[PDB]
Amino acid sequence: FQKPWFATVNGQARDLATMTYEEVAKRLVELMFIRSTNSWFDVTWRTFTGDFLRRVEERFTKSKTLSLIQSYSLLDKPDEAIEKVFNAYPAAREQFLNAQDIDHFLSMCQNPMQKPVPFVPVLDRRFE
Amino acid sequence: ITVARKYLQTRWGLPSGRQDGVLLVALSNEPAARLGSEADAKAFLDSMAQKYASIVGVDLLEEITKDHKVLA
Amino acid sequence: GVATSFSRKKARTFDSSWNWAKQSLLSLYFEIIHGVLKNVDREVVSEAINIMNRSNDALIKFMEYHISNTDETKGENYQLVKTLGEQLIENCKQVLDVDPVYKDVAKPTGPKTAIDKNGNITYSEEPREKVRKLSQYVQEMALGGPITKESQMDVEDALDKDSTKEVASLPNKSTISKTVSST
Amino acid sequence: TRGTNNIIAEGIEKMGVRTFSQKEMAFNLLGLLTPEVVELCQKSPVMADLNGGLQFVPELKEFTAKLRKELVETSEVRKAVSIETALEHKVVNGNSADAAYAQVEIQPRANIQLDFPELKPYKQVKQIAPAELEGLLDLERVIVVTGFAEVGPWGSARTRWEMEAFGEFSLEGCVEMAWIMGFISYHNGNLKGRPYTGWVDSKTKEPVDDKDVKAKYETSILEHSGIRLIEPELFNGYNPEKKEMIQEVIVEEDLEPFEASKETAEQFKHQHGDKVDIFEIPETGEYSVKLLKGATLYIPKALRFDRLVAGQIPTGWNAKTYGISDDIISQVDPITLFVLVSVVEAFIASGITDPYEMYKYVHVSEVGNCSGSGMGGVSALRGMFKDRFKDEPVQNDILQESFINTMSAWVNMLLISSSGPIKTPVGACATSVESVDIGVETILSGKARICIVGGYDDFQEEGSFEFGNMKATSNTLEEFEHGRTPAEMSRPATTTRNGFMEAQGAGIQIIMQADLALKMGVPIYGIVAMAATATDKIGRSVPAPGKGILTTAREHHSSVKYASPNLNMKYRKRQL
Amino acid sequence: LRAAQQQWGNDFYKRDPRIAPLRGALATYGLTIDDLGVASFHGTSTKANDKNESATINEMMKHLGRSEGNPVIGVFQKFLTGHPKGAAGAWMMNGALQILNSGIIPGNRNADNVDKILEQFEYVLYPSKTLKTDGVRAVSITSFGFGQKGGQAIVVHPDYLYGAITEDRYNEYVAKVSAREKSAYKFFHNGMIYNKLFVSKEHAPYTDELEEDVYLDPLARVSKDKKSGSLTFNSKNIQSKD
Amino acid sequence: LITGAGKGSIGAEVLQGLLQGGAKVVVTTSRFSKQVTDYYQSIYAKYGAKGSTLIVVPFNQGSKQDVEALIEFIYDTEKNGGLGWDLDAIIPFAAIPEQGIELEHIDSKSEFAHRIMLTNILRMMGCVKKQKSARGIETRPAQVI
C-alpha cells in the first residue's frame, strides 16, 4: 500500500508507543522529506516534524532555555537538524515516546490545514 | 410510616396499595442520611410518588382541636 | 501591637556543638571532594575556623579516621581533602583546650551602582580594590580621608590564592609592634 | 549600613565617607565587647562613633536627595528615550521585519522517571568487589530486592524520597503529587472548540500547563500532606475534638410513647420486660413503645481528646485513580487499598508489567506472599464490634476484611494467582522487618523463588485513642503549648522528643533469588544480606523496647591472637 | 557444586562463633564492619526508644570493632512520615534502597538539638542536614515493637552482586534490564494518564479444567496465547518431554 | 541578651559573632515560627562554638509584661523553670520601621514605636537592675550597647 504502517522502524514492525523520539523524527523525515528532490514534499509536513522536535525539547529539557529549532527552515537539512536536537537531549534516543506525547502525535495527524499524513499511525476505529 | 401514608393520601391522594408502591420506590432511592426538616421529608415523599406515577403510568381546623386534645 | 508574645514554654535552647562539629567537618569534606569548595574559596578557611572552634579529643579521632582513610590516589580532589584534612587535624590538636574565637574572613565589599545603556539601574556589591582582610579594613579606618581635617603593616596573606596554607596560619597568634593606632 | 536605598550608597561614598556592610558594623559593635573597651565602660560611659565620616558632609539631606534625583532621572529619561526610538523603528521599518527577529523561548515539561538503578561498565564493576568473589557465591541463595513502593503521608516512594532527601518537589514532584491528590486530571479531546492533550484542573476542567502546576497547587499540596491536623473527612468523621460516646442512665419517670414496627417493638420488650409496655395500634398494625420508670437508656455525650495530628495519606488520594474498581473499593477495608496500590506500584518498580510473566520463569507454587500487619482491618473491626452494636447497616462479611492475612489474599486473588507460600507476620511496630526475615527464609528453603514482603496499617479513631491511653503518642495540646507546628512534632533523638506521631499507609518490596533476577532481567536495588528477629528478656511491661536484637553482633573473642583463614576470601576460593 | 559454592562462599561463617552474623553478612562481599555506613534508626521520637536504640546500635558497633572515629550516620525518617506501626520497617527499607543507589543520606531535619544523653554513644552521628556522599556501601534498618518484637536487616549495595558473575553474563543482563525499563516507562505513563495502573486479573493462567494438571507438573510454564495474546498454560507444555 | 537580631540584620551578624566566640546568648524573635526556629538551628550548627548556647524566645519589646516576663525567666533558677543566668551584655536593637510619617502624621504607630525603641528599653535596663540588686550583685555590671 501507498500508506505504510508508520511505526515500522527499519523493516521491524512495532507500535507507536514502542518507538523512541529519535526513531519517530527519523521516520518522519524518511516518509515526508523526499530525498531525490532534496525537498519536503509539503510544507505542512515540514511544519509537522518541527512541532514534534520542539516537543522533544520541551519534554527533555530540565530548566527553561530557547529552542534549537528557531526557524523550521533549518529542517531543509533534515539530518543535520535532527542531530542538533538529539545531541542536546541525548536521553531522547533511549526513551520510548512518553504516553502523553503519543496522544499528541496522533492529534497532529488529525490537524486539518495539513496535507493528510502519508501513513497509518494507528490501528483503531478510524482506520478506514 | 403512619404519618408518611397520611401525607401520601392527603396531599397526593393514594389508597392502600398505591401508597405501597410509593414506599417501595422510596426504598430503592433511600436517603444516605436522615432528612432534617419535616418539610424535607414531605418534599422527598413528593418526588417519590411521581417516580411511581410514571412507573405505573398514573398522573396527579380539625387540627386546631387536635392541638388542644393533646393538652388534655 | 501591645499584646503578649513571650511564654516560657516556647523557648528553644541549642546546646550540641559536640555533634554539629562532626557534621560541620564531614560536610566540608564531601564538598571539597565534590569540588563545590575548591582550594581558593574563602569558605574552606571560614569553616576551618568553626571546626577548630570545637576541638574535642573526640572531634580529632573523627577527622583522624576520615582523613587518614582517604585514597589520595583516587583523584586530584581527593588529595586536597586529605592535605587540608591533615592540616586541620594538626590545628585542632593545638586549639584543644583553647577558647573559641570570632574571626571574620569574608571578602570585604563596597557599593557599585551602574545604569544600563537602556536605563536599567543595577546594584552590585564588589570587592574593595585596596581592601582584602579585616586587618586592612582597620587600617583604612585609622587613616580616615581628606574630609576629616581638624581635630575636635604588610603580612602577605595566602588568602584567595591557597586556602590550605591560610588554614595552617589560623592557630598562630599574630605579634605586632607597629600598633595601628600609630598610623 | 547596607543590607537586604543602597543605590545611592556608592554616591555618598564618592565624597570620602564610608558606608558599611552589616558584617562590618557587626565587627565594629563586637569590638565594643572586647575586654579592653568593656573595662573602659566600667570606669565611665563610652561613646563610639561608628559613623564613617558622614558627619562632615554639609546639607546632608538635600545632598542625599540630589544624588537620588539625578540617578532616578537619568534612569527614566534613558528608558523613555529608548522605548520611543524603538517604536520609531517599528514604524519606519515595519513590525513584520522585527517579528521574525525575536527568539522563541522553550518552557519545560515534566518527565517523571522511574529512576532505575545505574549499571556501570563491567570493568568498573569488577573493581568494587574482590576478584575472588567471581563464582564463589551460590546466587540461588543471595536474596535481592527487585522492586518497591509505598502509599503514605508523602505520596509514593518517588515523591516521599524527594521530600525526605531534598525538601521540595521537582516538576515531576508536583505533577505527580497534584495527580495523586486529585488536583489535575488528564484530558485528551476537544476543549471548548480547539483540541487539547494534557493536564486539566479537575474541578474547573480548564487546561493546566506543567510549568504552572507549582504556582497553582503546591502551596495547597504542601498544606495537605505529611504530618498535619487530622482531617475528619478522611476518617468517616473522626473528630479528636468531639469524640462520640454514650452514657447509661436509668429513666426516673415513664417516657412518652413512640410509634414503632411490630418486629421492632418486640425486640424492645424482649430486652426490657417489666420495664417497657408495647401495645398494638389496631388501625395501623404498628405498636406504641412506652419505656417505664426503671428502664435503661443510652444518652450520647461528647469528649475532647489530646491527639490532634496524624501522618495521613495526601488529601484526595483515591484508589479509584490508581485504577481500582468501585466494587473492590466497597467490598474491601481501606488498608487493603493501600496494599493493593503498592503491590502494583512495586511490580512496576521491578519492571514486571504482567504478574503472570513470573510464570514464564517459575512454577505457580514458587511465588509467595509474606506481607504482614500489626492490626490491619481496624476499620472492618469497628463495623463488627460497634456498627453492629448500633444495628447500623454493615456488611455480612466484615469479618473477612478484619483479618490480617486477607490483604495478602486480595493481592493474590486480584493480581498474582500464585499457589506459593502464604506466611503472614504480626510484629506490631516491626511486622515489616520480621516480614523480610520470613521472606528471605522462604526463598532460602526452596519453597519460593520470588515473594512479596512488606507491612501495612491504618489510622482510625479507636486506634489513636488507645495509644493516647498508653501515653505512647505525643500530646498535641502540650506540643502546641511549646510552640510546635504539626510538621515539627516528630523529632527523634531530640532533647524534647515527647512521644511518637501516628500515621497510616503501606509499603512493600519484592524480593527474589539473585540468580532468577539476573535471568528475568529485572532491576536490582540491593542485597538483603541479613534479617533477624529477637525477643528481649523476662519482664512485665509489654510496650517496652529492649536489647534482644543486640545478639546479631554476638561473636566469641576468647581467642583472637592469629588471623582466621576462614575470613580470608582468597583462602575460601582455593578450597572451593 | 552448588553446595560447595554454599559451603565456602555463602555460609562459611554459619558454624563459626568467632564470626558474628553481622560480621559475616558483610564479610561475604568483602565488606568490613566499617563499611556499614548508614543506620536507619526506628526513631520513634519517644524518650524510651531513641535512647535504647542508640545504645544498642552503639554496642553492636563497639563489640565488632568499629574504628574509633567512624560513627554510623543515623537517619530518622519517622520525622517526615510519622509512625505507621506495621508499615514502618518497609518505608525505612525503601529509603535505605534509595540511599544505597543515590549515595545521599537525608538529614533528620527536625533535630533542633541532639539529646545531650546521646553524646556517650560515640559510634553514632545524628545529622540535621542532608549529606550527598561519594558512596554508601550498606544500610542497617532496625525496628522495635510491642511484645519484645525486635528486628534488624542489613541491605548491601547492588553493585557488589555483579562482582560474582561472568562479564558475558553481566553484559547480557544489562541488555534485558534496559529493555524492561523502556517498556516499564511505557506502562507507567499509560496507567498514570488513563488510571489503568491497577488492572484486576479476571482469570487465572489456567483454565479450571487444567488447574490440577498445572499444580502437579513442576515444569509447567506460561506461554503467550495466539488468540488472546495473554499469558496462559498450554495443554502441550504440561507434562512434556520438551 | 540581644533583641532585634532577625535574619538579614546587623543583629544576626553580631549574633553569629557572639556564638563563634563561645557566648551564652538569648535571642528574641517577634515572628516565632518553624521557619524561624529552623533558621536559628542552622545558624547554631554552623557557628555554635564549644561552650556556646543559643536560646530563642518569642518576645514583644512593646509589651511591658513581656519585658518583665523575659528578664525574669532569665534570672530565675532552673528549678523554678528559669534559665538561671545573669546578663553581662544587653543589645536592645529591637525596632519598628516608621517611614512617610511627618510631624502631623505622628499617631498610633509612632507612639507604639517610641515605646519599643525607648520607654521599654529603659524598662528593660531597669528590670535587670532590680534582679542583680535583689541578689546583691554589685560586681557584675551588664554592658548596654
Within an 8 Å CB–CB cutoff, is residue A99 touching chain E?
yes
Three-state DSSP class for residue D205: coil
Angle between helices F34-47 and C17-33 (to 10 degrees): 80
Three-state SS for A40-98 is: ECCHHHHHHHHHHHHHHHHHHCCCCEECCCCCHHHHHCHHHHHHHHHHHCHHHHCCECC
Taking CB atoms and an 8 Å limit, are C100 and F32 in contact across chains? Answer: no
DSSP A5: B
CB within 8 Å of D504: residues ≥ 6 apart: D152, D153, D310, D311, D312, D313, D338, D457, D458, D459, E84, E87
**Which positions in chain D touch B2 (Cβ < 8 Å)?**
259, 281, 284, 286
Whether residues C62 and E134 touch (CB distance < 8 A) is answered with: no
For F5, residues 6+ apart whose C-beta sits below 8 A from its C-beta are F11, F12, F14, F15, F27, F28, F91, F93
Residue F103 Cα, gap to closest chain C Cα (Å): 22
How far does E58 lie from chain C, in Å, by closest CA? Answer: 15
Contact E69, C64 (CB under 8 A): yes
Chain E CB within 8 Å of residue D479 CB = no
- The number of C-alpha atoms within 13 Å of D193 and in the hemisphere containing its C-beta is 0
Cβ proximity of D158 and E97 under 8 Å:
no
Nearest C-alpha neighbor of D372 from the set D328, D342, D406:
D406
Q: Would you give the DSSP letter of residue F132?
A: H
Is D429 annotated as catalytic? yes
Torsion of CA D571, D572, D576, E6, to 10 degrees: 180
Phi and psi at residue D241, to the nearest 5°: -75, -40
Task: Using a CB–CB cutoff of 8 Å, tell me whether F62 touches chain C.
Answer: yes
Cβ of C116 under 8 Å from any chain D Cβ? yes
DSSP D71-96: HHHHHHHHHHHHHHHHHHHHHHT-TT
Q: Is A17 on the interface with E (CB under 8 A)?
A: yes
SS3 D301: strand
Report the distance separating Cα C121 and Cα D557, nearest Å: 74
DSSP assignment of F15-26: HHHHHHTT-EEE
Rounded CA-CA distance D306/D479 in Å is: 10
Distance CA D384, CA D375 (A): 15
Say how far residue D70 (Cα) sits from the centre of its chain. 56
Contact check, Cβ <8 Å, D111/A59: yes
Contact F54/C at CB under 8 A: yes
Contact D39, D21 (CB under 8 A): no
CA–CA separation, C37 vs C31, rounded Å?
A: 6
Active-site residue, selected from the candidate residues D41, D370, D429, D451: D429
CA distance F42 to D430: 33
**Cβ-defined contact of D114 to E181 (cutoff 8 Å):** yes
C68 to chain F, minimum CA–CA distance in Å?
24
Nearest CB neighbour to F143, from listed D41, D483, D485: D41
CA-nearest of D514, D541, D538 to D526 is D514
What's the one-letter identity of residue B55? I
* Among candidates E112, E128, E129 on the partner chain, residue whose Cβ is nearest the Cβ of F37: E112
D47 has a chain C CB within 8 A of its CB: no
- State which H helix or E strand residue F11 sits in: helix F10-20
Burial class (CB in 10 A: 0-12, 13-18, 19+), E147: middle
Decide: helix, strand or coil at residue B70: helix
> How many residues belong to chain B?
72
Q: Which of E12, E59, E93, E139 to mutate to test the interface with D (most CBs of D within 10 A)?
A: E93
C-alpha cell at B3: 404519618
Contact D512, D448 (CB under 8 A): no
**Considering only alpha carbons, which residue of chain C is nearest residue D482?**
C10
Q: Cell 538483603 identifies what position?
A: D528
- Name the residue among D108, D186, D197 with its Cβ closest to that of A61: D108
Distance from C-alpha of D520 to C-alpha of D516, rounded to nearest angstrom? 6
Identify whether the C-beta of residue D348 lies closer than 8 Å to the C-beta of residue E184. yes
Give one word for A34, left, alpha or beta, with left for phi > 0 and alpha for psi -120 to 50.
Answer: beta
> CA nearest C59 in F: which residue?
F50
Task: Give how far the C-alpha of residue A88 lies from the chain's centroid of Cα atoms, to the nearest Å.
Answer: 17
For an interface test with B, the pick among D280, D284, D330 (most B C-beta atoms closer than 10 Å) comes out as: D284
Q: Which residues 103-122 of chain F have a CB within 8 Å of chain C?
A: 112, 115
CA distance A91 to D225: 33
Q: Give me the residue from A59, A98, A103 closest to D188, CB to CB.
A: A103
Judge whether D146 and D347 are in contact, CB under 8 Å.
no
- For this entry, resolution in Å reads 4.0
For residue F58, give the chain C residue with the closest CA: C6
**CA dist., res. D307 & res. D304, Å (int):** 10
Coil vs helix vs strand at D215? helix
D478, exposed or middle or buried, with CB in 10 Å at 0-12, 13-18, 19+?
Answer: middle
Q: Which residues of F touch E111 (CB under 8 A)?
A: 41
Cell digits for D317? Answer: 488520594
Secondary structure of residue C88 in the 3-state scheme: helix
* Residue whose C-alpha cell reads 506543567 in the numeric block: D210
Long-range CB contacts (within 8 A, 24+) of E17-20: E17/D555, E17/D556, E18/D555, E18/D556, E18/D557, E18/D559, E18/D560, E18/D564, E18/D566, E19/D555, E19/D564, E19/D566, E19/D567, E20/D552, E20/D553, E20/D554, E20/D555, E20/E63, E20/E64
The alpha-carbon gap from E197 to the nearest alpha carbon of chain D, in Å, equals 5
How far is it, in rounded angstroms, from Cα F115 to Cα F67?
A: 12
F62 CB neighbours in chain C (<8 A) are 1-2
Tell me, yes or no, whether chains A and C touch by having 3 or more C-beta pairs under 8 A. no
- D523 in C contact zone (CB under 8 Å): no
With an 8 Å Cβ cutoff, are E189 and A18 in contact? no
Nearest to D522 among E180, E188, E219 (CB): E180
Q: Which of residues 145-204 of E touch A (CB under 8 A)?
A: 182-183, 185-186, 189-190, 192-193
Helix (H/G/I), strand (E/B), else coil: E83: strand
Question: Would you give the DSSP letter of residue F141?
Answer: P
Touching F (3+ Cβ pairs <8 A), the chains are C, D, E
Residue E119: Cβ within 10 Å count: 15
Q: Exposed/middle/buried for A10, CB within 10 Å: 0-12, 13-18, 19+?
A: exposed
D330 at the E interface (CB within 8 A)? no
Do residue A100 and residue E193 have CB atoms under 8 angstroms apart? yes
DSSP state, F115? Answer: I
Asked if F20's CB is within 8 angstroms of C100's CB, the reply is yes
CB contact under 8 A, F10 and D29: yes
Please list the residues that pair with D500 across neighbouring strands: D473
Residue D183's nearest CA partner among D165, D200, D171 is D200
N-terminal to C-terminal alpha carbon distance within chain D: 76
Active site residues of E: 42, 83
* Alpha helix stretches (DSSP H) within D332-426: 334-349, 358-361, 378-385, 398-402, 406-411
Residue of D nearest to E223 (CA): D360
Tell which A residues from 35 to 94 touch E, by Cβ distance under 8 Å: 94
D289 burial type by CB count under 10 A (0-12 exposed, 13-18 middle, 19+ buried):
buried
Beta-carbon pairs below 8 A across chains D and F: 43
| Pick from C103, C109, C111: nearest CA to C170 | C103
Backbone conformation region of residue D212, classed left if phi is above 0, alpha if psi is from -120 to 50, else beta: alpha
Q: Which of F30, F50, F57, F117 to mutate to test binding with chain C, by most C CBs within 10 Å of its CB? A: F50
CA proximity to D140, closest of E161, E140, E172: E161
Q: Scanning the structure block, which residue is given the C-alpha cell 488447574?
A: E211
Place of cell 558473575: E165
The shortest CB-CB distance from C15 to any of F49, F53, F112 is to F53
How far is D33 from F17, CA to CA, in rounded Å?
Answer: 11
The crossing angle, in degrees rounded to 10, of helices F10-20 and F34-47 is 40
In total, the C-beta contacts within 8 angstroms joining chain A to chain E are 19
E183/A96 Cβ within 8 A: yes
Chain F residue nearest residue D22, CA to CA:
F10
Q: Count other Cβ atoms within 10 Å, centred on residue D78.
A: 17
Q: How far apart are the first and last CA of chain F?
A: 11
Residue (of D224, D184, D181) closest to D204 by Cα position? D184
Name the DSSP class of D503. Answer: B
Mark yes or no for CB contact C6/F69 under 8 Å.
yes
Written as one string, the DSSP assignment of F26-92 is EEEESS--HHHHHHHHHHHHHH--TT-EEEEEE--TT-HHHHHHHHHHHHS-TTTTS-----SEEEE
Beta bridge partners of D312: D226
Residues 25-84 of F with CB under 8 A from D: 32-34, 37, 58
- Give the ranges where C11-133 is alpha helix by DSSP (H): 17-33, 42-52, 57-68, 76-95
Beta bridge partners of E141: E40, E153
DSSP per-residue string spanning D479-499: HHHTT--GGGS--TTBTT--S
For the domain bounded by A6-122, which CATH number is listed? 1.20.930.70
